[model samples]
Target: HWGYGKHNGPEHWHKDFPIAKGERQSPVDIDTHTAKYDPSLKPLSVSYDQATSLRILNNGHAFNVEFDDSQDKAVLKGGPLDGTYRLIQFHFHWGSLDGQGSEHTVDKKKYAAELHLVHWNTKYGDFGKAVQQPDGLAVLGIFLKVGSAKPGLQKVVDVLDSIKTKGKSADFTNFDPRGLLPESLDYWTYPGSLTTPPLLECVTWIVLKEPISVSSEQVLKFRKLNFNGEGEPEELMVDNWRPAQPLKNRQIKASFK
Candidate 1:
């Protein structure tokens, strides 16, 4: 077995997926020092509200949840966006080994990890339905830098100790994800497909530049997840990111300008 996590590992993914090739991938590595970015086109702006949708499920692949607010689709403040979408699922992409998480890159820089805030446009109906829309979803990315403390993520990690083993998770909780967002909501916007297979090009990517920090030990627990059946031996499953893909003349613009 290639050891693809039963539900989400790329190894088990269909061989025909676009990201399967090394050339067409994202979250690579963008040397921010030399690379320049526009600041106005920050792809998404979150609306801070208490009534967002929150869900935490195991799905046997990874621990994740979805939201309804605390973030918004790029449109007029009160424009037709009509909250065009609702945060559907929020999960993570970690390193397979240690220092390689994330699917897209700024110029070509891949951080130690990446967090995904998944949302689906509201026009369609529910996540199951919106997914069928031409512009059905949006996935915002947040990079993770290895550091002494994971200030924003500490709360997330604090609860992980008890859930370190598989088939476990923090009980139903209410944590404001906005707290997890980068200081500046500015993001790089693009038209792309799901980084994973079924490679649906039905998403609008809003990748954020800011990242949260996590201690070395905290991040390591992620590698212990059971990739398949309980009987399978556990191996480090840290590198969960897809390879970077060229835009093919596809425009990936920042909302900075």
Candidate 2:
């Protein structure tokens, strides 16, 4: 199985999944000097329903909070997206050390962690089907810098103890994801793939320029979890982020000057 380790990491992924070396792979370094300002890009529009949050689970890769997407209860529009995209799930990528964690870097600068809010195009009917099309998914990436604790993120952190092992989960309801977003929606947009295995080149990545803060202690809580499931040799879940991939033939557009 594909994983982030010395032997099974990203470099070895292209062997099984050829597209890991594809042209439009994600988590590319955002070179501000090379990015062009696009006035046509509108501010992102997002709406959420707390009741839609179903549960949170550790899927052997990273922990994610899933949402019930049967209706238009939560959706994202505008900001380089053609049609409304339903909120499917949200997850995080973090590092073992406080210095490096984020997948997509800013001018070769790494953050303490990164948050990914994943959405799928409604035009394709469902996430499984949408993931196959070119304009199928839109993922909002928010960087996390080490600072004071954030109350919004604490809700997720508080529940980490229940899911210390891979595949463990708990009911996570009535949580508003908006609390985790930054004040500014200004972002850099590019056509990229999922930053994980089966790296399909069907995502429109919208990485926010501004980042939210999280305390160092809070990040440590994430490391307490194990990559291995119960009854297996314990493997701490840290440094789950994939390194930046090549930006060949892709242009990174900025929403602001």
Candidate 3:
């Protein structure tokens, strides 16, 4: 029962998706047949340390990053998704073992883990109010694999000493999203929903083909995260990833002209 079985695993999450009907998801492969490439791509800009409230909650397996009020802006001029979108919260889903599994599947293949940087559409007024609108969310997915080094992600890990256990987060001020992003922002995207319960289907997923590597030790550390109580010193979240799913007959596309 403890090895992530049917009763305790992903089969048990969706009873709570915000939209309930927003259940479309991914891991769908992007290729010449499904994508339209726009070579003039640039990095996604995020002003970290812009000063806002940030909280980490273990909503269950993956967890959530609750940003008080942040926004997503298309730093590149000619980008297809060139517009300002609010950054709501972000979280990640990973597996027990490295180089083996994650939450999102592509062409039916599994990766080590999946990181979702959640955002909101400007079509709505603000982040708090946008939650009610169907199209108010955007999620950027990054694949994480095992490696010996990743100077970029270290900024996040440096503070890891703070949130050592679940429900044990500190103020974590002066944080910026750029340092956490993979070196390349070129990505493949699709229309989908939150992988968690209430499976809010309002998400526009941008999955990066290129993955960032963290040492296998870090992977173990993530799995061991204590997510037990709100006031405990700390609880680890060991083995926080879900297996792959069938791509079904859905359409997954990329941003290209």
Candidate 4:
């Protein structure tokens, strides 16, 4: 079993899953100087239905907010994508210490945290099926910085107390994820994979250049989450981010100056 432990962690992920060392591996460092500016890249657009937000859960990895993608009520368009990609779920990656955690870094600098909003191409039929294809997933990566608390994040933070332990969940509805995005729509795009196992190489990574703010106190709440379930040795859920992978021959495209 792959986990964030000494014997079964990221360093050993390739042993069980050979694709972990694949060419299109994700969480690679984004060098702004090397990224080509693509004027052809369209403006980013997201249409989300507040009511479509189903619930939030702790899967022992990161807290995930599952959305109802049965319909095209919530979709991500523009900024390096060809067709509509339905919003499926979103989760965050943080570390035990500040300035560490973010899977994708710019100029080798890591942020306080990173949020991954997972989406899948509609043409692929279903998310489970789409994930197998090359152009199946499009993940929006928003970096989080330590500063004044963001009001939009309060709705998510409020539910953390309910799902403090792994496998716990609460009915979370009527929330719009758009509120959590930064003002600038500027981003960098490239081909990558899911940061976690099975480390599938089917994602089109769209990482926002600007970051949203979260208070120092609020970041500590994320570390409070427990990795274990009932009647088990409790381990603090932190540092779940995978180390940055090699970029190989992939070219990163910038949507802005």
- Say which candidate scores most in lDDT: 2
Error of 2 at 8 (Å): 0.5
lDDT agreement with native, every candidate: 0.59, 0.93, 0.59, 0.92
| lDDT of candidate 1 over 195-219, digit per residue (tens) | 6655666676676667777778778
- Look at candidate 4 and tell me the lDDT of residue 117: 93
RMSD in Å for all candidates: 4.7, 0.9, 4.4, 1.0
Highest TM-score: which candidate? 2
Clashes of each: 41, 0, 26, 0
Q: Candidate 4: misplaced stretches above 4 Å?
A: 49-51
Rank by lDDT, highest first. 2, 4, 1, 3
Misplaced by over 4 Å in model 1 are 1-43, 51-55, 67-83, 96-98, 161-170
Per residue, candidate 4 scores C-alpha lDDT tens digits across 148-196 of 9988888998889899887899999888898899999899999999999
Model 3 lDDT tens row, 54-77: 666554354565666634432112
Residues 61-96, model 2: lDDT tens digits? 999999999988899899899989999899999999
User: Candidate 1, 83: how far from true, in Å?
Assistant: 4.9
By TM-score, the better pick of 1 and 2 is 2
